[PDB]
Design a protein around this ligand. Structure first.
Ligand SMILES: *Cc1c(COP(=O)(O)O)cnc(C)c1O
Lengths: 330, 314
């Protein structure tokens, strides 16, 4: 009678609120017995949770959408990481440029099936065809394969893959600015990371989920309030994250953590749109999320979302060169 | 309709045969879709597999025995790592010595549950009581906590924890010999199934072990190419520590995957004496799902076993 929680990824700096809810005894104090699991292949995640083999976990906004469409009943009950910049990453002199036309004849890596689906469709809007470029499945190793020259560019998150590149560049004495991203946003909300449940599990255990999120909230607060003490506890438990790369990633993640855990309606709306257009989702498809199991007031919708996004881009650039923990102010 | 396989630990060098069976397409070529999972806490493992939430996994012989006793129906269907030396590891100048009496007043780390039970019971055979010593649960971090001085000694495997200590010693300029250890079959690592799953899918398990066998062969035949593939997929293992661990593991890999009857017999005994197992308890393993012939002085082989890749010769 343990509850299974399956991450989207190998342990990352942004899983901290979950591991801490464990180590600090927050889950225990709620009468929950959580069995946190890590996947070897993110591709396995939605299917396992949808099929009820696993009770809860995390995945990106899009995959959560595509999961129900593809027949796996999952519902997003909370939000972990909000709108992290996603895009095609590449090193300067790849030789790739700001023009999506440079992707011609290049090997471009992706993790998920959907990353291919995304690139495949972008090629049409720029005159080229799949395939005037080679798509390579790289799973959790996109950045790594970039650095080793097995691919020319690949899909990733600004606060994970991009950092891994910058740290590599620092070794080569190159400047961090040489790590570049063609943003798919320029709705970067596709890679928002969500707390998801099996629909059936949620139906039968509403109160346990509510309690789960209470524990998650308590830890999320701690992490945002005192990121440094938090980080020390985290890496004491998960030493594989006790390196400089992981810490820099952690700092870049700080500004993207959701403080409220609320699903953002606007974002879901946008991505569901994207989803229908890409043919990933049926015409009558309905967004599979809910804020019902959150036990604190919803925050006010961001007044000007597109300015907050270009403000974040700046904020994150400052984080890179100052090495700080600051929340984006509005 | 994926099959879930849950490892006993974070990815380790000795999981190589499984990951390779995945990356090399051996599972695929058997029409199996395996979802390999890694636990955050080894202790969660047998309960998850026993309860059917997870189909298959790895766990150590003692755990697998105690699992059925404790009400979780699992069956060992094959063997991954045979009789790795297990014991209490400590650094010279701990100050701990060959005499178990030195454990008095020391902080002693154990991984989850069974280690405390083991130490607790050893203290009686040497005149001391639980607790003339402090037991500390360390999970997958025993060696790490030893190095940092949070504990004085802790329970571990010669080819994993001990190596982690030796590598630390090399950094301090100390000699490897300064890493010391006080039926070592209790920590044999097994391929286990949920009893119900095995009942309903006998042929898939048989095919699973075929894939595992193919990869195990490759690993033993050409350990170096194997290792390169493994760490290409799992970069966290691409370091010198992991490679040294890998080399120490090489001699312990089971080439045949067969459960060893003698070993199970011994540990079941141990199990009953420790009260972990009921009096009428019956060993929960089987070689039925292996599809190749079973192989033919155990105590001399053990003292014979005590930077190369060589199999122990007999
Ligand atoms: C479960 C496990 C352990 C330890 O748990 P204890 O109950 O303390 O023994 C140790 N090693 C492996 C490989 C395990 O799977």
């Amino acid at each position: 009678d343990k509850i299974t929680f399956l991450l989207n990824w190998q342990p990352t700096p942004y899983h901290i609120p979950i591991f801490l809810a464990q180590t600090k005894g927050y889950f225990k104090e709620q009468g929950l017995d959580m069995a946190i699991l890590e996947p070897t292949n993110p591709s396995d995640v939605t299917e396992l949770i949808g099929s009820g083999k696993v009770d809860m976990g995390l995945k990106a906004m899009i995959h959560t959408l595509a999961a129900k469409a593809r027949g796996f009943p999952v519902t997003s009950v909370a939000s972990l990481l909000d709108e992290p910049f996603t895009g095609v990453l590449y090193l300067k002199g790849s030789g790739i440029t700001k023009s999506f036309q440079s992707l011609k004849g290049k090997k471009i890596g992706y993790v998920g099936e959907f990353g291919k689906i995304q690139i495949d469709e972008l090629t049409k809007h720029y005159g080229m065809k799949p395939e005037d470029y080679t798509a390579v499945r790289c799973g959790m190793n996109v950045a790594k394969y970039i650095i080793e020259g097995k691919i020319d560019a690949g899909i990733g998150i600004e606060c994970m893959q991009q950092v891994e590149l910058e740290e590599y560049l620092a070794k080569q004495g190159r400047p961090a600015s040489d790590a570049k991203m063609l943003r798919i946003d320029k709705c970067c909300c596709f890679c928002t990371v969500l707390y998801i449940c099996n629909d059936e599990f949620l139906k039968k255990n509403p109160e346990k989920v509510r309690k789960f999120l209470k524990a998650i909230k308590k830890a999320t607060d701690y992490v945002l309030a005192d990121p440094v003490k938090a980080w020390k506890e985290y890496i004491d438990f998960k030493p594989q994250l006790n390196n400089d790369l992981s810490y820099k990633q952690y700092q870049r993640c700080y500004a993207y953590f959701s403080s409220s855990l609320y699903n953002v309606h606007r974002d879901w709306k946008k991505v569901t749109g994207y989803g229908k257009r890409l043919a990933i989702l049926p015409p009558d498809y309905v967004s599979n999320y809910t804020n019902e199991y959150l036990s604190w007031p919803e925050p006010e919708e961001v007044s000007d979302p597109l300015e907050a996004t270009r403000l974040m881009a700046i904020h994150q650039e400052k984080c890179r060169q100052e090495g700080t923990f600051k929340r984006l102010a509005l």
